Design a protein around this ligand. Sequence first.
Ligand code: K
Ligand code: MG
Lengths: 505, 502, 517, 513
Amino acid sequence: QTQQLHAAMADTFLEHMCRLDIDSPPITARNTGIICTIGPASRSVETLKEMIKSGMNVARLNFSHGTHEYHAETIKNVRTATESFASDPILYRPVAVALDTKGPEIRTGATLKITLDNAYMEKCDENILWLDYKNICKVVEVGSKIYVDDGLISLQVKQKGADFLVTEVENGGSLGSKKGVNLPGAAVDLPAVSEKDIQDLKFGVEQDVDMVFASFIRKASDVHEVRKVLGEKGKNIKIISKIENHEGVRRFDEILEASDGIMVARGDLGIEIPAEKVFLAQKMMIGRCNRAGKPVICATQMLESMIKKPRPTRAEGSDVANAVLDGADCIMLSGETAKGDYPLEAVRMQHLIAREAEAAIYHLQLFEELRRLAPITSDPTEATAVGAVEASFKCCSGAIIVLTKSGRSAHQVARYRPRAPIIAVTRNPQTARQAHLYRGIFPVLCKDPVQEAWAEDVDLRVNFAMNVGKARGFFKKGDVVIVLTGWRPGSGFTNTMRVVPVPHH
Amino acid sequence: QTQQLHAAMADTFLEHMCRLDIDSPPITARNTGIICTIGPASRSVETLKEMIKSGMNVARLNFSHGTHEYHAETIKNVRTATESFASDPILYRPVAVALDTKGPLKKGATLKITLDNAYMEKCDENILWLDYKNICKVVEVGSKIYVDDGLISLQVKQKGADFLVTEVENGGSLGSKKGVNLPGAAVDLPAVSEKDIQDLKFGVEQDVDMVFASFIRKASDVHEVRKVLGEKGKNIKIISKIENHEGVRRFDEILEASDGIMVARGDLGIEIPAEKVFLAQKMMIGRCNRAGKPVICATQMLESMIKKPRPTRAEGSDVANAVLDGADCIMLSGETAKGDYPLEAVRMQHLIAREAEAAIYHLQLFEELRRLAPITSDPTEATAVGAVEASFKCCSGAIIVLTKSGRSAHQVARYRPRAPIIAVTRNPQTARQAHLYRGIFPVLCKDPVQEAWAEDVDLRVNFAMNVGKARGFFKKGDVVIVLTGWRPGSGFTNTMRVVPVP
Amino acid sequence: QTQQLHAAMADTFLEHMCRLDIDSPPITARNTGIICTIGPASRSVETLKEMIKSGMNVARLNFSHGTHEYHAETIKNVRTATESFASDPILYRPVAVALDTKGPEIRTGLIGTAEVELKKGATLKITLDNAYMEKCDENILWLDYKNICKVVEVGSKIYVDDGLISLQVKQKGADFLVTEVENGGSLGSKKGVNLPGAAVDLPAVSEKDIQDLKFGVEQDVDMVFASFIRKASDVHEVRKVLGEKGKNIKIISKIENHEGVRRFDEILEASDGIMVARGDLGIEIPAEKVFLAQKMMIGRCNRAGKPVICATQMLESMIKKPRPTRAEGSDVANAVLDGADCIMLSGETAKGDYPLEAVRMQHLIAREAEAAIYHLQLFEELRRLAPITSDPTEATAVGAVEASFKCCSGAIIVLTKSGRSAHQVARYRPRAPIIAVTRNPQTARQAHLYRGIFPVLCKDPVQEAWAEDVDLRVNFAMNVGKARGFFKKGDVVIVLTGWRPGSGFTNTMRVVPVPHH
Amino acid sequence: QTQQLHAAMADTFLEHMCRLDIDSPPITARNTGIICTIGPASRSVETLKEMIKSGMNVARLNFSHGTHEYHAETIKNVRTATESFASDPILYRPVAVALDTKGPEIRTGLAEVELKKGATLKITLDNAYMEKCDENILWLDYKNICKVVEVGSKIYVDDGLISLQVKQKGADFLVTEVENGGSLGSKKGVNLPGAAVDLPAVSEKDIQDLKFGVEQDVDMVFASFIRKASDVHEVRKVLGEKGKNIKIISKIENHEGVRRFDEILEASDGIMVARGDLGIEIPAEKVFLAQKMMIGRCNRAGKPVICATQMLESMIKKPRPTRAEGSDVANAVLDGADCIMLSGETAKGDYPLEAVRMQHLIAREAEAAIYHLQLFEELRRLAPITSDPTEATAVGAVEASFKCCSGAIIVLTKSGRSAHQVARYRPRAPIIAVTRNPQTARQAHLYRGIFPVLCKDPVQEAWAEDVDLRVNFAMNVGKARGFFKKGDVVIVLTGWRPGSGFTNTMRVVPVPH
Ligand SMILES: [K+]
Ligand SMILES: [Mg+2]
């Protein structure tokens, strides 16, 4: 009768749906990470403090707009707000910083001629239109569509020239200046990173960002170019590939294997592909990410109306819940937090919905399927991790506590989608920030010195997790928890599972 | 490579999700019924014609506003537009008419009185008399009161003889004679208001197909609606609107008494915390699917399309997920009534519904629906499930059902075939009401009853075949499933044929 | 509370096992065909009559022994006994005749009627030189398989006398093998030889088998059980030997060595069905592995929709005793649970003291086991493993099985000329008995190869009106079911017919109450 | 391609069956315990030594026959043979001793006579007919028979050879019609199908035999003709304080025992599916039903279940089994039986060793052919949720063992319980249960997949070192017995503290060199 545990026991998905209960309150932990775009509504230290208290886990910076100086100040304010809670490490929540690349762009019933001749840069007119992509003719054929201004206008190419295309307008409207262009279904040969992106990525390395959301990723070689630009110095920065067109969807597998995770970039994706197909692409990407054990971000227009209003639409409530049910590691806000009224209310709403939806997951089937789909491996940590998730379902444990340096051991627990929150204790601050990318990891940053005796140093970090869970209201004294450690100094890796009562002290 | 058939063959739900393919185009048939609220943007004969061509199946009339004269004119226009396609019965689409009833400082203190103060409406004077005489008896220590579609919130602090004193939880600017909601309360108001009795009588007179009854909280409310409809209105389907805590909690008794359900997310999300609406939606759609009774997902599905020609990504998602949940119908509430882009909103529901119907995991849904259905001696039940099984085995272009009452087609639809169900009837009301059920494409046979029974059956079967060819559901040489009876009357459906399309 | 219907409703196999109920009596119908080897205990007209009444569906004739005249007399006696019930077509049970080939053999030579002792790890030279034909001793053994040296290597085993003796080849010659004895014992004359793991190149059919097959065609047998099938080309040689005249005779391949198991898929594809020939199979492969081969063959046959027979030593002790062992009860039940279309009796019916009791026991056990099948999972798996097809009859058949589970129907009634429509129903393993109405007497006999088909031979003339002729045959099935106690008035049955006179047009399913006669 | 692992990966039971592979050889470990009845063919020290080497895990002693002196000698010989391997604890195999009671009986009076289908036979309870049993009048020793039978009831005489139907019911007599005739001898056993038999839970003789079992330090009792929970409790009380650690396996052998199976199982330490007498009591065609139901419910409750009687019956005379017998053993294993049993085959037959060896061979093949994928899913779904840490650890460990194809699950256990908890989830990998308790080690053979090993090293002063010693012992055992080698991954279960009840620690460890 709490946490949708009646529904959890159902023998079928249909009966699971039938037993979902609005009068079954959720547990206090919320597992899905919340990524908030920072902008004019949300940059002040004071607002960012409430933003964190409301449930922000990742600050997204959009490099489509704003100078290096502007963004450096946003990062500084994020860190000031974040570090204002640092005096009580029991209560300190790590907050990641994410850099979102601008990425390459194309810019600027009747007949309508596209031209590449630069004399028409200054005289864009309703008969002849200039764009900046010089290889457009190689990637388009007769029958190709061209979309202008976030898909407001639509053209179909009728004849192909050396330096020009003659098109027929399909969807009319008002054409302005310096408007965005999309090429549905094309193999676009724009570089993986623009001149501007190379500068922005180098800036992210300099600013110690935790992850990059790389725009318009179409193929594996694009991810590799981002990685090489990040270089040796930025090798620990996670690359989240943004899938935003047909080619990215079609080549998803190669992109996933090369990436540290994925953003379902529904905005541009829904311009590039028919809007009615976005949910298909969303569900396929979330499923394959869950199958690979790689973080996946659901982004854009979840709570859109809350830019103006203090409460979401029913479609928006539904969208957040269903992203979580699909299996998304990370819901996102894009302007709800950046420039809207009610930025705090939007964060709070994501928190509330995510938590409800986490209880409504059909763990019984999800766990079975994740186990059946997972390769066998001789890797001890993998075996320990699945063993720990199994044990956590068997005893309804209040948490799975994982000691981890790199984060990897906790990531391996999270891929099997326990109901119980995963308290990942690390001394590595970057590990703690990056762990937000994974469903159910509650990262905590241990600031105590390394004890001389290894056994005591383990017990110290375990007692820290115990204090965190009590203080955050995940569990109380006497409840059973699962503890994952290594057995032996820094040698080996996470291979030891203990089932322990939460102590009085 | 078509209709997500690669995904359909997956052994797990996870692999099913992983195989969903934006390049696997859907079939032309669209199974989920589209209900459109008619209002100033959508009442003209000319707009209603395009509205039908765009995919409207049910015209909803909202008796929250508008006189009988106004609504009678809307109905007339719906029928004019509908009957403009009647010359080609191959291409004629039945269109149902539905009547929707309507029977009801941040910390600063406000006294609610019942003694008449309709003359004053200020923050100083505090919250007006309101119309609800029994309010004091149905609220307790702790209770909340929501005013103006949940904009303001009050928590009751003291309980008096004639009055209750509250502290406001959520402050704002308080207007006059606005809506009040009582979260978690057992509301004593009558099942149907004085106005609703008149509106229901008017619906009987205007030959409506169904009633969406507001604010159903218990079975005895459904029974009061049924009794008001009386003998005259016994064939009018009652769809109960679940819109508060008590209706959700008593859902089972309400379902049993109703012909179907509307998940009324608008008022529901004012009554219960908005984060829990999806819970209530999924539980109601599941239980409806389990009982074989129609369920409507309603309210803000494409809300932004009131102003814009394209929906948000959350809206696209919501429509798709309602279909995936199992909703028989989706609804538009002002997207069609008063918005710009009414046609584009209808078209978008059509497009999304079709995509989502292909992405259903039929393999698991069908297993579960079969296992959760009771065994029975009923031949029609056995025939219907036999027919759905056969339709999966040969990827049939349709299941053709001859039906007088609709019931035989309803029994097919509850097992959720992929194939569209072409329901051939001579009963015009049956044909209109069939739009309540996922996958039933009703067709109204206007040919006379032949002297020979076998010929009359074959006539109706060939009509369905012509409909399917003309609407692009199937072509010559594809296989279809045909359900008929052994005997003239309703309730003898027992014969299933697997036939190639001529 | 009957037919293990509490167990039928379980959500798990484990709970299914847990709800199996000795106090839940089965229904009257028994779906698994019983094949009885006929011999001295069971050849008289009088014994064959009781044999039928006890539940024999198929009379098996073993051409390892007995002259043509002896077997012709057995066939005649089977027909006499069978046709003695033909005056009541309501109660007439078709009976198939099966010819089981001797097949190719490897045999030892002689030395009058004495034996010799092979010991421990003593040396034994096998020779192909015919001077040792009648001069076999404990130093030298003669065999008739001239190519043995080409198909065996250093390390190979050779088994002599139904696996009593075992040899390992140590040196390989032109015309000889020198072997070490592994398992000793008493070596007699003209004893059988097995070559575990070898690609034996003996012909598909022996000189004797050619005679026997010609005789089977002449005697109108329904099926051939072909021995020692090792590859698809063996099945095709049997088919070609049968030729045009024998083209309607079903070939059941007997899998009885390693190579036959390994090449099972090509053999199945070429065959009409399979016999799991556990006797010789358990001489060829370790005895502990036979259950593996049995379950693999039954599963793959169920998956292909081809008949499979479980054979040999099922009720072995009932050769001498009036009641079986607990392991034998278990073996029968588990063959049925595995999915076997037919079970078999060999010595138990051919030469034992208790032939009728053995038939009756198979009947009793089969019926209990059919109720204990977990239909819920079997049906789901059979449906998922079946290819989609545009074939109407396939869709009709699966639709009908689904409908039969939905209404707990007393039967599925199928009108069929060739048998095919009924076969298509049976492969989805309904619990309800399949009453297959045919006018073709061969169809009726052959239908026993399929789990659940109760064949009935309509003898009424073809009516002039097609609709009336259909109704006649449906009413016949209805009377059969009433008379056999499968259902009564008011119970629901499923009826499969066509739209049109010719075979391959079965596309119509009706769910009908059983009427008052 | 080695342990039916292709079949293991199938998505359906049907495809699983289809992929079963005669050319996929099993691994070394054999999980199903083999119980051998000891008698004239198998009592010598020298035969018992080979018997152990062939795979006997439990020596069963049948107290239906033989004096205390005879059985004392059998037990002594079992211990001599068992302890002849004791010098190498790496290789030593514990061998349990089991006492099987005679139990209550109904027996005829006092040379044979012919009974005919259709003819009258009056049973009497007046003792003057003790010596004067004929074709018209029969003696039985069950005085309350009249109260437990009605008009219509059946009575079976001489292991079900003769069959009578009662037609009239008297004060101290029954008049019956013979259904199945035959030759009626003297002193023959009687069965009452479907009756609530009120004979005592234990006979006068059984009380003496159980007291003798306590004296002889037996590990378990197979208690005959258990019909209800209160029968198991009477056995427990007869065993008393001194025999409180002796496992009681209830023999289900009639209708009432099957019908009241749930209450019997709850009260018992395990069950024997006694197919012998069971198939006399109930129709033989229904035995498989009772067998499958009992094995399932035992698996579901996590209590040992023994499949007994006629498994390799023909091997009393022949060196090879029938195909039905091969099948029966395989299917008992597939059903889920913890142990398989040999009766005449080891007690009095030729080929006692070959019968043991055959059980070993078949058990091992059939353990590979189990569809673990479904069995594990079902067992974990059907198990109650619990706050018990050991239960969570145990299931965690089995899950981990599937994920890394571990060569073993090593469990430190005093009472056996922690290893029993692992075994009920039916891992593929063998469970090496390290104990210092020799009784624990013997009894663990009742549970599928437990390989018990008896640590004889002294208790080290430091507790952590003493734990590591026992883990290393298990590692040495597994290497030596060929379960795993250097570098393979294994699962190790220990606890946080000394004493029983504290197992909470699971380690995934590579096997060291
Ligand atoms: K005994
Ligand atoms: Mg043979």
